[PDB]
Amino acid sequence: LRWDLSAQQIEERTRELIEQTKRVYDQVGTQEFEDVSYESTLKALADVEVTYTVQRNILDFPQHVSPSKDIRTASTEADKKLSEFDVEMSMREDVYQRIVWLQEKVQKDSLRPEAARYLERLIKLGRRNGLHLPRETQENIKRIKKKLSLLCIDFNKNLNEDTTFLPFTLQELGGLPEDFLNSLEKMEDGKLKVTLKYPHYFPLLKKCHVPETRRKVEEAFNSRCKEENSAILKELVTLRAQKSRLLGFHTHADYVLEMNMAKTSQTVATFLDELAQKLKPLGEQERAVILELKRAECERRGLPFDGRIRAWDMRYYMNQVEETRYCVDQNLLKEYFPVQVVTHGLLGIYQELLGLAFHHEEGASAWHEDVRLYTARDAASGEVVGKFYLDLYPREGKYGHAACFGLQPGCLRQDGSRQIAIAAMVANFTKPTADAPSLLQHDEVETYFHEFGHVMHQLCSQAEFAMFSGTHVERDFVEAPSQMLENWVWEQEPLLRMSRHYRTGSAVPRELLEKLIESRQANTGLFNLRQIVLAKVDQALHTQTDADPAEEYARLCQEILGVPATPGTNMPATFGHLAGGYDAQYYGYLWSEVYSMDMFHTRFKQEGVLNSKVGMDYRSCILRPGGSEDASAMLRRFLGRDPKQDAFLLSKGL
Ligand SMILES: [Zn+2]
């Protein structure tokens, strides 16, 4: 890895990398049948993926962290050129022919398991790209893919470019903080301008006690680009269905799910239906609580009470439930979670769980002075497992959300020796200063624990092929290991290891810990039922022929969530995931979370949350394979059976 590359070197490095890499593909793509071999074909492609991946990451990473705008821009441009190149190589028919020939020449069961898996994946990826099909079919696929890309760009752009706003008086905005107010564009009419952007939308629906104001904003927000985007959505659905058939599948969902743990649309439907049925009674209880809060508040404020929970009441009363029903003094809690302490305790927990020791590399080279490099070594032999950087504080130009970026993949080099994985964890926790400690909210501690889990997956994986390194697993399983790990921030012992009053050094009071842990369940029934509605709409649009998005969403909202969609709106027309690469996979969020609880409850809760023996089995069964083993097989080995929804429901008190 190199971090001192200028904007010009990035530009130069990109052209060179592409030319050198393309060279290997050209060589593989022009081999005569007779010269096709495992070493000249499979190994050649596997080897170049290793050299290319390392270099590519060095070129596209700076855009997310470099303090230099010139470097960030060149990195972004390189990323685009490299991404185009990746697609270009994946569509190479000449190269695919040699891979198909190799598959023919390779004797049955002659290859090592991961090598066989790699070959099968290459064959599969080409077929999913339609390279084995007739020219007329491929031409149609190409034409449809082009239209789909443009439609998706417009769907998102329409939403992002929208500048709709609603004018409200200080009274109509009752409930909103002072800091919030004033920050609004005061109109020459006196009224304040409220936009539909998230920074304005969410706080308003959660804090504004004026019902008519919440109603107007909800209607507007869920009606953005209604006409144009509903039209684009209808075309996306039809075109995706046609492309999927041309590629050999009865529905787009089935095409998409072939590569996921869920495998088929049927499996997903049953999953969502059963989950909805099981959560129904919890939803009924939560709605009864919210309706009572609304009745009481309307009576208190002298407002009319319609006896029904409206879409614009949800976020408001769910927040009230959390504040008045669970009562967690977050301001007090924060004082026990200074970032330095959380970092130390968090690293300590992962060390013990995985049998590792982290070593700070003082003075190591980094893209920013606040960045810290650590070497993870085996706790008994001291042998290096991998390396990771921690870039935790905000700064101009830096990626705004917490994330794990794989930099160097753990895999085998051309000579057979293993190269260690190197990853970087990025977060944006306030940096501690002179007399201003950085106290973390519990959600930040949760995010921290979650993200570092991915770092450990990156480093502990021992795949031999780059394609299967680290977090390169099924999309509906990649989040499962980290969500399983989030459970630690809801357990007393682990929390105590990551906390300490920043000033007095006192431990978090057990009474406070109890309430905190209990607050985890707040509004969970309705939160999940809504996610199910979204997952079902996504599946319906990608399995149904002529289902109407708005109508399907409305029907599901009433039957599952118990809260009606506002007439005249069209939430699906604003549903960005439908045009952001999550098409047919939205259920993945619930899928990973549900099964992550089985992983946690079945093994860690029964054998010891801080037991290193269970931790080593987790490292061995779940992390070590990387993507060299199907998720279903890793889970079956870790759980001793196939996963179930039982643990998740039990955690909800069902
Ligand atoms: Zn994650």
Side-chain angles (χ1 to χ4, degrees):
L1 299 182
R2 314 155 187 169
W3 301 130
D4 56 58
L5 290 182
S6 64
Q8 185 173 303
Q9 294 170 304
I10 289 181
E11 178 192 64
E12 299 173 57
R13 284 287 210 298
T14 299
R15 285 193 292 281
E16 296 176 55
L17 179 57
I18 294 181
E19 300 176 8
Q20 294 177 60
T21 305
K22 181 178 176 56
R23 178 181 181 181
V24 173
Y25 279 83
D26 291 335
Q27 308 185 316
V28 176
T30 55
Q31 304 184 78
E32 296 189 63
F33 174 82
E34 184 168 49
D35 296 307
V36 170
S37 65
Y38 170 98
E39 300 91 329
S40 80
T41 308
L42 185 161
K43 194 183 190 306
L45 292 177
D47 288 349
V48 75
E49 186 174 345
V50 180
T51 60
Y52 177 78
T53 297
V54 179
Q55 291 302 307
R56 191 207 204 297
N57 291 334
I58 295 179
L59 301 173
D60 60 42
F61 186 54
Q63 71 183 302
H64 303 116
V65 297
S66 178
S68 168
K69 190 179 180 183
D70 290 320
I71 292 182
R72 242 145 49 215
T73 53
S75 174
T76 294
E77 285 308 297
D79 184 7
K80 296 189 174 179
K81 289 189 185 62
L82 296 170
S83 292
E84 289 179 54
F85 176 63
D86 288 344
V87 177
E88 189 187 317
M89 294 304 100
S90 73
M91 294 300 287
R92 290 285 293 267
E93 296 189 72
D94 57 334
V95 175
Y96 193 65
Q97 172 67 84
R98 280 62 190 178
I99 290 176
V100 173
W101 279 337
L102 179 61
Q103 181 181 57
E104 179 190 314
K105 309 180 74 178
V106 169
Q107 185 181 306
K108 180 182 180 180
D109 307 305
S110 298
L111 313 184
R112 175 150 71 176
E114 201 176 331
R117 187 182 177 79
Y118 176 64
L119 172 56
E120 298 179 314
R121 184 66 66 75
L122 293 182
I123 284 293
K124 177 64 68 184
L125 293 175
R127 295 177 72 76
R128 291 178 60 73
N129 276 319
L131 307 186
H132 62 301
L133 301 163
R135 179 55 51 198
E136 186 180 8
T137 294
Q138 294 198 57
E139 291 176 65
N140 274 287
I141 290 173
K142 179 185 178 182
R143 178 180 55 68
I144 294 176
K145 283 171 55 182
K146 192 173 183 182
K147 295 177 183 178
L148 286 176
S149 292
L150 294 186
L151 288 172
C152 285
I153 294 173
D154 291 346
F155 190 91
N156 296 130
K157 180 169 64 287
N158 287 343
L159 293 172
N160 297 321
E161 300 191 322
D162 178 272
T163 60
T164 302
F165 73 82
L166 294 69
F168 295 104
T169 61
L170 292 168
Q171 284 293 300
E172 302 178 308
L173 295 175
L176 286 171
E178 285 304 307
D179 46 294
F180 187 79
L181 300 174
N182 292 303
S183 300
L184 307 177
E185 176 189 300
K186 180 177 179 181
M187 294 179 82
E188 302 174 300
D189 181 57
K191 301 179 180 179
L192 299 180
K193 173 180 173 178
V194 172
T195 66
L196 298 188
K197 303 305 177 184
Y198 294 43
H200 284 179
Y201 185 63
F202 289 66
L204 182 57
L205 282 188
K206 298 182 182 180
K207 295 295 180 180
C208 179
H209 59 63
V210 181
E212 259 295 293
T213 302
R214 297 200 304 267
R215 175 188 162 291
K216 285 176 183 177
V217 178
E218 185 273 314
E219 172 187 58
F221 182 93
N222 284 315
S223 296
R224 289 171 294 151
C225 314
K226 182 185 174 185
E227 300 297 301
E228 326 81 75
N229 274 21
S230 60
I232 290 171
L233 195 49
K234 177 189 178 183
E235 202 170 309
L236 289 173
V237 168
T238 304
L239 287 178
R240 284 177 176 158
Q242 190 185 343
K243 176 171 175 284
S244 68
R245 289 194 305 272
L246 287 167
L247 289 167
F249 297 81
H250 51 301
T251 71
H252 181 61
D254 291 306
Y255 165 73
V256 167
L257 300 171
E258 169 176 59
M259 304 306 282
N260 286 184
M261 191 180 142
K263 289 293 179 294
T264 71
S265 60
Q266 292 63 42
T267 300
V268 174
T270 301
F271 173 84
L272 298 172
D273 286 353
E274 301 186 320
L275 192 59
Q277 297 177 56
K278 275 76 162 289
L279 293 172
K280 189 175 180 180
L282 183 57
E284 288 177 46
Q285 296 170 52
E286 297 183 3
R287 287 194 297 277
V289 166
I290 287 174
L291 190 56
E292 169 63 18
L293 291 177
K294 181 177 171 178
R295 183 203 66 64
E297 175 148 336
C298 283
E299 180 184 65
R300 190 180 310 100
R301 297 180 181 287
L303 300 163
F305 178 59
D306 65 5
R308 294 199 63 191
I309 300 174
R310 302 290 179 176
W312 61 86
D313 288 334
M314 288 295 271
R315 291 189 179 293
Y316 184 74
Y317 287 107
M318 288 187 279
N319 180 63
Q320 203 170 82
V321 166
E322 173 177 49
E323 307 194 316
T324 71
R325 312 277 300 192
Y326 293 82
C327 321
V328 173
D329 197 327
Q330 283 295 306
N331 290 307
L332 176 63
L333 188 60
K334 308 189 309 175
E335 311 195 327
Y336 296 89
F337 293 85
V339 62
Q340 325 79 267
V341 177
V342 177
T343 293
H344 182 76
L346 182 157
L347 292 180
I349 293 176
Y350 275 96
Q351 274 184 161
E352 180 174 50
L353 204 54
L354 305 171
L356 303 169
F358 305 142
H359 298 79
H360 172 42
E361 300 294 359
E362 293 169 45
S365 170
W367 54 88
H368 188 77
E369 62 178 65
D370 298 327
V371 179
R372 296 289 180 276
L373 176 61
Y374 294 80
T375 297
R377 293 175 180 270
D378 177 290
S381 65
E383 295 301 322
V384 177
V385 172
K387 289 181 169 62
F388 69 84
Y389 298 85
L390 291 186
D391 186 347
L392 316 169
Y393 314 120
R395 62 166 176 277
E396 189 180 71
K398 171 181 173 179
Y399 184 71
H401 312 70
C404 172
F405 295 82
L407 298 176
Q408 178 169 297
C411 57
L412 302 183
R413 300 181 201 284
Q414 192 192 197
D415 75 328
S417 63
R418 174 170 294 283
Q419 87 177 187
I420 63 165
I422 300 182
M425 202 206 85
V426 172
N428 289 283
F429 309 132
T430 307
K431 179 185 181 184
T433 65
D435 287 289
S438 177
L439 309 181
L440 275 51
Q441 299 296 324
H442 183 258
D443 58 284
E444 299 183 87
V445 177
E446 181 173 58
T447 297
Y448 199 168
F449 213 87
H450 174 112
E451 229 45 71
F452 194 79
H454 285 307
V455 175
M456 290 297 95
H457 192 174
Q458 288 282 177
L459 309 204
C460 292
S461 53
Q462 295 284 290
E464 303 190 314
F465 291 78
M467 180 175 277
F468 301 143
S469 69
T471 58
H472 284 146
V473 298
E474 294 84 342
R475 278 192 63 176
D476 54 353
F477 178 71
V478 69
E479 294 305 315
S482 288
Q483 280 174 144
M484 178 202 78
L485 290 164
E486 292 185 15
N487 284 291
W488 270 250
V489 304
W490 299 100
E491 286 287 320
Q492 286 186 40
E493 271 36 62
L495 281 174
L496 291 171
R497 288 174 57 162
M498 293 183 277
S499 55
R500 185 208 80 204
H501 191 278
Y502 79 99
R503 204 250 303 173
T504 73
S506 298
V508 183
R510 296 287 182 167
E511 185 181 301
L512 180 48
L513 286 178
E514 290 186 301
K515 292 183 183 62
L516 171 62
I517 293 176
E518 185 52 56
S519 70
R520 187 185 192 180
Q521 309 299 302
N523 308 302
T524 189
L526 291 174
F527 176 78
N528 278 290
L529 282 170
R530 175 168 174 285
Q531 291 304 311
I532 289 175
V533 168
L534 292 176
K536 284 183 177 177
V537 167
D538 175 46
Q539 290 298 302
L541 297 188
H542 299 107
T543 57
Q544 228 83 64
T545 297
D546 42 53
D548 179 58
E551 295 186 307
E552 267 299 291
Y553 176 72
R555 183 180 64 69
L556 293 172
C557 277
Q558 186 55 61
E559 308 187 320
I560 299 176
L561 183 55
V563 180
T566 301
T569 62
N570 191 329
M571 182 277 145
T574 72
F575 197 9
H577 289 69
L578 300 174
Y582 296 80
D583 44 299
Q585 318 206 204
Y586 196 81
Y587 79 95
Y589 291 116
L590 288 165
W591 184 276
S592 59
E593 195 177 313
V594 172
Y595 295 144
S596 68
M597 185 58 70
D598 199 7
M599 292 167 74
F600 179 68
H601 190 71
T602 305
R603 296 304 308 279
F604 289 96
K605 211 65 177 64
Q606 305 310 311
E607 299 157 57
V609 180
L610 296 173
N611 187 320
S612 66
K613 298 185 180 180
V614 186
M616 300 308 284
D617 282 349
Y618 169 69
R619 175 175 171 183
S620 185
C621 295
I622 307 303
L623 308 185
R624 197 188 209 78
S628 71
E629 291 176 17
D630 295 346
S632 63
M634 296 191 266
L635 284 176
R636 187 176 297 92
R637 300 189 186 93
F638 187 62
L639 301 170
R641 59 167 169 70
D642 290 320
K644 305 203 301 299
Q645 310 187 323
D646 294 35
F648 182 77
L649 300 172
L650 177 57
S651 72
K652 304 299 180 180
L654 298 170

